Amino acid sequence: GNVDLVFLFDGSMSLQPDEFQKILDFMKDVMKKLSNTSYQFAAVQFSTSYKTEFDFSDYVKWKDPDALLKHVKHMLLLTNTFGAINYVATEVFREELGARPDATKVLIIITDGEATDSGNIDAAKDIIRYIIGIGKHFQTKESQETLHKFASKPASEFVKILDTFEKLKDLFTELQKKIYVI
Numbered sequence: 666g667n668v669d670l671v672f673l674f675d676g677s678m679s680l681q682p683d684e685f686q687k688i689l690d691f692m693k694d695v696m697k698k699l700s701n702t703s704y705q706f707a708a709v710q711f712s713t714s715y716k717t718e719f720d721f722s723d724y725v726k727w728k729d730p731d732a733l734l735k736h737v738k739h740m741l742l743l744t745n746t747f748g749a750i751n752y753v754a755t756e757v758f759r760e761e762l763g764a765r766p767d768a769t770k771v772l773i774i775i776t777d778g779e780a781t782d783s784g785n786i787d788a789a790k791d792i793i794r795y796i797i798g799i800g801k802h803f804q805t806k807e808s809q810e811t812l813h814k815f816a817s818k819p820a821s822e823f824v825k826i827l828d829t830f831e832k833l834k835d836l837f838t839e840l841q842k843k844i845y846v847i
């Protein structure tokens with residue numbers, strides 16, 4: 666019933682300042698809409714390295730997406746997606762950061778490029794993983810397909826590709842049509 670949800674977001678060099686900002690604003694739009702629910706949130710920037718920008722405890726105490734993300738600094742480096750996802754699994758989904766042990770775990774990966782590292786995500790198997798790939802880096806079917814190994818199956822359900830960063834506005838509109846009292 667409880668959902669612990671991590672936004673794992675790309676801070677690579679390829680992102681223009683306004684593109685990075687549109688990611689930030691997308692995350693806030695989502696959290697604001699799901700205020701006062703069974704959702705609790707944390708946000709991790711990844712590039713070459715990984716940074717938990719805020720954790721579940723931070724979210725619980727303040728409940729203010731704007732404040733929680735105010736101090737994000739765009740890393741401007743690589744796109745170490747394998748390491749990032751592994752970092753979330755082992756270093757973010759923990760009591761110490763406010764995670765609830767029995768909650769349903771959800772990861773929302775937002776990226777504008779293919780991974781710069783390699784390996785596996787065995788450690789993240791218990792997490793429901795969604796991945797949003799954005800921009801001209803994902804023009805080809807082959808580039809979209811590379812994202813599939815990161816997300817839960819089927820890709821048709823757990824993978825979304827967006828032509829541009831403006832389409833995050835549109836995805837948020839669509840998302841809200843999937844909100845129900847169950």
Ligand SMILES: Nc1cccc(Sc2ccc(/C=C/C(=O)N3CCOCC3)c(C(F)(F)F)c2C(F)(F)F)c1
Pocket residue numbers: 668670695769771773793795796797821822823824825836837840
């Ligand atoms: N089709 C597709 C593919 C890739 C990305 C997306 S975007 C997305 C998707 C799902 C969710 C939330 C899911 C959620 O909370 N669930 C469904 C799984 O079971 C637990 C509840 C969410 C969230 F808003 F609730 F967090 C998104 C979001 F965040 F808008 F990106 C959509």
